[model samples]
Target: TLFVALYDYEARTEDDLSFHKGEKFQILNSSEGDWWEARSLTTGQTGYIPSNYVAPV
Candidate 1:
């Protein structure tokens, strides 16, 4: 599934992906708590994004 970013997020760790609000990301993994692994459709960068920062689209 895919999600649309609800707010801008700056990468805080090496495992995070910086993204802008409204950017769409493909859900790669959701097994982790609070954060989920996602891939940016615009940049193809894969990393963790806070689950609450996005909404299903």
Candidate 2:
């Protein structure tokens, strides 16, 4: 699966933060099923997010 970060604010477009669209992220690990650990190629940051947020590239 593939995905991009659409929002960066503290509360879903309700705060100030860096917003990056169409950023490339690749899955690093996924064992819990619904959650996936991913890393951003653009920023070099890694974190876990819901699998639903990702789509086939």
Candidate 3:
């Protein structure tokens, strides 16, 4: 399965606001570059984040 990492850090860039380190999220769709459309599993909010923040668990 795939999982996202949520961190307590603020977004460094526009795309960086997608997810945090340790924050679990679901991949909604794939976007251009290394970005992915995702939603927060814990909050139900949706946004775009880098694909690198997600991986198989």
Candidate 4:
């Protein structure tokens, strides 16, 4: 599934992925509670991201 960042988010940990508002990311997995495993289409980076920071695109 595709998602877009709703706000700028700075990764707080090494397992997290930082992204800017409006950037697109693909959801790889959504079973990780509040965090979703995703890959950024803007940079091809993969990491856990805050589910709340993104919206369905």
Name the top lDDT candidate. 1
Which ten-residue region of model 3 has the weakest summed lDDT?
Answer: 6-15
Report backbone clashes per prediction.
0, 0, 10, 0
| Residue 34 CA displacement from its true place in model 3, Å | 1.3
Name the runs in model 4 displaced over 4 angstroms.
none
Clashing residue pairs in candidate 4 are none
**Which residue pairs clash within candidate 3?**
5-20, 5-21, 5-22, 5-23, 6-20, 6-21, 6-22, 6-23, 7-20, 7-21
- For each candidate, the alpha-carbon lDDT, in order, equals 0.93, 0.58, 0.66, 0.92
**TM-score winner between candidates 1 and 3:** 1
Query: For each candidate, what TM-score against the reference?
Result: 0.93, 0.58, 0.63, 0.93
Q: Return the candidate ranking by lDDT, descending.
A: 1, 4, 3, 2
lDDT of 1 by residue, 1-57 (tens): 689999999998899989999999999889868899999999999999999999999
The CA lDDT at 27 in model 2 is: 77
Model 1 worst lDDT window (10 residues):
25-34
lDDT tens per residue, model 4, 1-57: 699999999999889999999999989889769899999999999999999899998
Please give the lDDT score at residue 2 for candidate 4: 91
State in Å the error of residue 7, model 2.
Answer: 6.2
Report the poorest 10 consecutive residues by lDDT, candidate 2: 9-18
